[model samples]
Target chain A: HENLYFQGMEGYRLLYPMRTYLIVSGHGEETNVMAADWVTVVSFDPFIVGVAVAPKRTTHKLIKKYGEFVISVPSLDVLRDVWIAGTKKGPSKLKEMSVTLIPSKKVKVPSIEEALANIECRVIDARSYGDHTFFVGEVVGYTYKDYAFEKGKPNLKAKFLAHVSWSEFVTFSEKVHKAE
Target chain B: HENLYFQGMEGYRLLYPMRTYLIVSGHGEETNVMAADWVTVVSFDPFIVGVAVAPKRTTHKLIKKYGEFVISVPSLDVLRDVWIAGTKKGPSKLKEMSVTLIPSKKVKVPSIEEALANIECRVIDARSYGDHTFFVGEVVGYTYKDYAFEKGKPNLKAKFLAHVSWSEFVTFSEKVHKAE
Candidate 1:
């Protein structure tokens, strides 16, 4: 009866199709962007966001160096950018991928010009839990394409990407429902 | 050119359409389940799942007492359960919602029988950030429906719910893509 239950890393897959984002870190020639799905809004009163990154990633090293990063929400249209950012390494990757970076209002890290939204954050707390370091950032500044949202909620027309698993991604259905 | 960028709580909306879950805590007559969207995989080496809940919720108190909880992935089919569990308070709400609970092999908290998956976890760390407490839980046990996955990833037929905002919830599109 309980044979379906199990333990191991595979169990983590049950949480997937998680919204993925591009984490931008560092400044000028040192910048790097990487695709991340392990991110969430941890606080609302002062506005805080948390993302887990392996220390080996260049994005993580740059975040440690500058204490700031930008979370850019990518749409399906930028699938190629997301893949290159996640798969490629080094400071030269962004340039090779041809991702245009524009100045962020409140951070040294630049924002991805093609992203649907860019959130500038300053690292407030960081702690190691297993192999990944959880970096909690305070949202200091943010910007979104004017049409990214409708009536104060996410506009599905934007086709935001959610990582389904390795090499796979998905967007939401056109149908929406309201819970009574 | 950058007029689209802005500041405030509204900024958080850009990250919407987040996968939501029903967090079940406590045991037997003391059980309580609440809707939570702020959850993510924090680690892979030891398998950790993290969720942020405000101190005011009864579910938070229960997790503190037992140091264990179950994360149930809800499909749109349980929209009423998600809404009632999130809106109504007290230990008796589950009964009112007619949610059947089955025994969990690793924790005192029972698993929601109808959920697509049930993850049993034990708290490893707890910390307060802003208005909420972040609970880092190590996965001790897990179970999923046989049909929840196909070819090692979430099956879109499950119709998993991702909260857009307020009472609005959505499911993913049928089309899936692979990145080079």
Candidate 2:
């Protein structure tokens, strides 16, 4: 029921603790998806997530208009698809590419069928940080694939890709030890 | 001298690739410092560095007033001193603590004597994110201990502690491989 093999650059290694995905939707039938590296979990209570989106991007416009989006975490197998979805414009990509969209359980937006986990969120606050608009979202609902969780935790050992810059990806093979 | 140690928590483990340090400065001799996790080199030309400081911090005030600060990269041996400087109020800590103050080579403020490397910066631009202010600084001067660099590159191999979250740290034994 799942496909694993995808085409990508050979030298494009994945970064450990890869970035989470942002799937945004608007009032009309409009939807936009973008991969962002500048994102992190800012709070634990009620689960708050922060993502920085460049103002010039189409995803920013959609989120500004709707104030709702879905956060998705994908496995390394979806690297090519993630890169394609992130690089291509929404309207054009939606028309040209074959991406399966599923209705979100909590939000009005649609989640990509390729993601391993999804979290629905409503924008609580926003601020302009230089070229990017930082949006802090309040988590409303969350769902994860059975394999993504182990003993009630997200299993990062499955390998994920992290975007270093444009057209480059890093994986989490190298070990950096923890300080006591 | 350098020391390395291991730290572990419930579900998270990481090797820190760089020694975590606090950027501090004073406004009219009232000093302040805070812990920073999201820091990076944004530009090479004119040497620009960016650090994200949370809004709910006293160091933000000092940085805003002085428009300058020093970035100190400390070793594992000075963890306790770094923790005290980060958690306590600057004026109170200064009076009760025995921290060594060394004059910065470029900036008006002073740096912690235990730091392995210090970067003096002048704020060029600042942007407010949701709960954080991203300060973009232009590096004006730098001072490093004899062990800080190797073959003209930053020898972060030793004395590097990674900041996983508040009060959490990690050390690196091997470098995270960069994408080609």
Candidate 3:
């Protein structure tokens, strides 16, 4: 949107285009999943990532309890499941979605095997940020598929889902220009 | 870069393909501009946006002092200036940047007139997250231009500047798919 704040209270839904991430946390039968758009890379040296989890979310409880979680970088192939994860609540939600759930190497919480990549992180800090809790996680380990690679970086062909509007999705494209 | 962790310290950079944003703060002669990638919209109804600011930066000090800020979305045209804003510092920084400065309607601080959009926000909370203080700002007002790079509607297309590596940037190009 030209202006995120101009469209009244709901104008934010049309704010910046956000990438959809499937954040998984908890252990065994207690694992839960949530679709997050409020996410960003925090640190350069340690490779920390942050996601804002609303207090009412079951995913927030697991992150607060275990301090370890998995961020699944899902492609457009898993859009429906991811969207369902965002809509549904509690531990059994993942059971309804057909995406494969696999254990992470470092974190007890599982990651989506169907994803392009899975990042295992240990929560270093969790603080209140407005209506959500900003959870900062330190990267402990990660897993990826061969198809998601090109040269040494990610293959642009692999379309990671992005959220623009209600039920709308976009993907990352080639670089517009190299920064000087 | 399938896994941001395996690449050691450098791999951390690949955690998420983040959008480059112009974080504006302070008022009149006290205003400052900084380029940041660690920013995201956290809430919908209330419309909260968060930015990670290192305490050492002069921009961080101004935000803490004023408690209000503007996030300006610039098209790819201002790539160099935004990068300069991130790297350069001191009271005389914005004076050298060629971007046009105009006063915001609600906030005392000025926003880049050349930007695709301007979001006026009030800081609701500030908390430590990793090496930065994650400040959550509530949207109060917004203003924008009509470049419409993505589509005819500026809402459908506002050239969002995304960052992959240090100097590498990307943007959303057309809708790939809508879930059936």
Among the numbered candidates, top DockQ falls to: 1
Q: Which ten residues in a row have the lowest lDDT in candidate 3 chain B?
A: B148-157
lDDT of 2 by residue, A107-168 (tens): 88777676666777788877554445667677777666655554443344554454444454
DockQ order of candidates, top first: 1, 3, 2
Q: Give the Cα lDDT of each candidate.
A: 0.88, 0.58, 0.76
User: Ten consecutive residues with minimal summed lDDT in candidate 3 chain A?
Assistant: A1-10
Candidate 1: lDDT of B87?
92
For model 3, what is the error of residue A128's alpha carbon versus the real structure, in angstroms, after optimal superposition?
3.1
Return the top candidate by TM-score.
Answer: 1
Better of 2 and 3 by TM-score: 3
Count of backbone collisions in candidate 3: 1
RMSD of 3: 4.2
For candidate 1, list the clashing residue pairs, or say none. Answer: A143-B5
lDDT of 1 by residue, A9-77 (tens): 266789987999999999988988999999999988777999999988998899999999999999999
**How well does model 1 score by local distance difference test?**
0.88
TM-score, B chain, candidate 3? 0.85
